[PDB]
Amino acid sequence: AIILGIDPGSRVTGYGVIRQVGRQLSYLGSGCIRTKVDDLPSRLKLIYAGVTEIITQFQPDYFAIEQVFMAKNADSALKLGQARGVAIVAAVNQELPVFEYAARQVKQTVVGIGSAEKSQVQHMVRTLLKLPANPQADAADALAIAITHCHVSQNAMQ
Amino acid sequence: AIILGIDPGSRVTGYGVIRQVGRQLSYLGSGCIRTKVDDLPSRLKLIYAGVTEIITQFQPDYFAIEQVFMAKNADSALKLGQARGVAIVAAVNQELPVFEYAARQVKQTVVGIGSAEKSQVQHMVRTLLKLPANPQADAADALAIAITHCHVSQNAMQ
């Protein structure tokens, strides 16, 4: 009913927390963790301290994380991997269940087209959230993987 | 006093603890945690536990991981990047100071040559830690990296 959506990376992991009262979508809070520091241990440290922070603050029922179908540069991907993994585990160690969605599935879901440009997806995220957004470091991307989970979760088995 | 070298692998992870006392090198133990399990969320967490159960059971001072740079498979990069990010955090959170060694400082430290091959390396490890011993699998890859730390710890101050 309360979903954390995390779009993690080398440099910064963004976050989107929202509730869903059956069909009444609702913005709770979003943001971007900034783990820029040179050192890995510590940058991995910050991902975790932050994520489990959000958890400990928003008290979320599910964990949404998107997946990788097109993850083309080898050494850029190792780093996504470590960022990925730490975020996942902080979630798991918090007892929250992790849900992996294909970016393919996140576009179809929000905007109705899986060939939609990122700003078309960001645009819909903020219409829907009625976000008086004057955007940033584009937290909407994490917000969007959040919406998705709902659609799917309230769509599966019948 | 106590060094732990780790070899994080999505499917398997070797460890090697050694004891450095003065200039006296001593073998405490080694093995491999078999994190073979389908659900990604659990592999990870198994890495996390396994690595932590060794940290408490053995109680290292230091943590030593070998850096990963070249690889050119980007589906596997992301597969090795998660695990290795989960193994590092496991130690961050137990209050272990973590150090990375390039695959070539390791060869230079135990084999004398840089472009050595592992048969050599692993061959020479059993010697260092005077141990003509019965390889389960072969965690010899973690003992070498832990051995490196003991060397590149014993090097410039004065």
Structural domains present in chain B: 1-158 (3.30.420.10)
* Torsion of Cα atoms, A97 then A98 then A99 then A102, to 10°: 180
- The per-residue b/e assignment along B101-111, b for 16 or more CB within 10 angstroms, e otherwise, is beeebbbbbbb
Q: In what order do the strands lie in the sheet with B24-34?
A: B24-34, B12-21, B2-7, B62-66, B98-101
B7 given a catalytic annotation: yes
Secondary structure element (H or E) that encloses residue A18, with its range: strand A12-21
Experimental method: X-ray
Q: Which residues touch A139 (CB under 8 Å, ≥6 apart)?
A: A14, A15, A16, A30, A31, A32
Task: Locate A33 and state its tokens.
Answer: 């963790």
Closest A-chain CA to B71: A74
* Phi, psi values for residue A77, rounded to 5°: -80, -30
Name every residue in B having a CB less than 8 A away from some CB of A.
40-41, 44-45, 48, 68-69, 71-75, 77-86, 88-89, 91-93, 98, 100
Active-site pick, B100, B117, B138, B141: B138
Bridge-based pairing of strands B98-101 and B12-21 is unpaired
* Phi, psi values for residue B36, rounded to 5°: -60, 105
* Torsion of Cα atoms, A90 then A91 then A95 then A100, to 10°: -140
Instruction: For chains A and B, count residue pairs whose Cβ atoms are closer than 8 Å.
Output: 92
Distance CA B15, CA B53 (A): 12
CA gyration radius, chain A = 15
- From the CB of residue A82, how many other CB atoms can be counted at a distance below 10 Å? 28
Concatenating the DSSP letter of every residue in A50-62 gives HHHHHHHHH--SE
Give Cα separations from B25 to A97, B1, B28, B111, B128 (angstroms): 44, 10, 10, 16, 8
Distance CA A19, CA A23 (A): 10
Q: Which residues of B touch A77 (CB under 8 A)?
A: 74, 77-78, 81
Burial class of residue A53, CB neighbours in 10 A (0-12, 13-18, 19+):
middle
Best mutation target, B89, B93, B94, to test chain A (most A CBs within 10 A): B89
Q: What angle do CA B37, A155, A96 make, to 5 degrees?
A: 45
Q: Record the resolution, in angstroms.
A: 2.5
A53 is in an annotated binding site: no
Task: Locate A67 and state its tokens.
Answer: 């997946």
End-to-end CA distance of chain A: 18
Give Cα separations from A114 to A105, A107, A110 (angstroms): 7, 5, 9
Secondary structure element (H or E) that encloses residue B132, with its range: none
Task: Locate B90 and state its tokens.
Answer: 């496991």
Amino acid residing at B97? P
| DSSP type of residue B113 | S
CA distance A19 to chain B (A): 23
Helix (H, G, I), strand (E, B) or coil at B48: helix
**Contacts of A45-48 spanning 24+ positions with Cβ under 8 A:** A45/B89, A45/B92, A47/A8, A47/A13, A47/A83, A47/A86, A47/A87, A47/A90, A48/A86, A48/A87, A48/A89, A48/A90, A48/B89, A48/B92, A48/B93
Token pair 């496991």 is found at: B90
* Phi, psi values for residue B98, rounded to 5°: -100, 125
Distance CA B37, CA A123 (A): 39
Distance CA A141, CA A147 (A): 10
The reply to whether residue A44 touches residue B79, judged by beta carbons under 8 angstroms, is no
Distance CA B74, CA A78 (A): 8
CA distance A151 to chain B (A): 22
- From the CB of residue A37, how many other CB atoms can be counted at a distance below 10 Å? 11
Residues B146 and B64 sit within 8 Å (Cβ to Cβ): yes
Q: In what order do the strands lie in the sheet with A98-102?
A: A24-34, A12-21, A2-7, A62-67, A98-102
CA distance A86 to chain B (A): 6
Tally helices (H) and strands (E) across chain B: 5, 5
Q: Which residues of A touch B45 (CB under 8 A)?
A: 89, 92-93
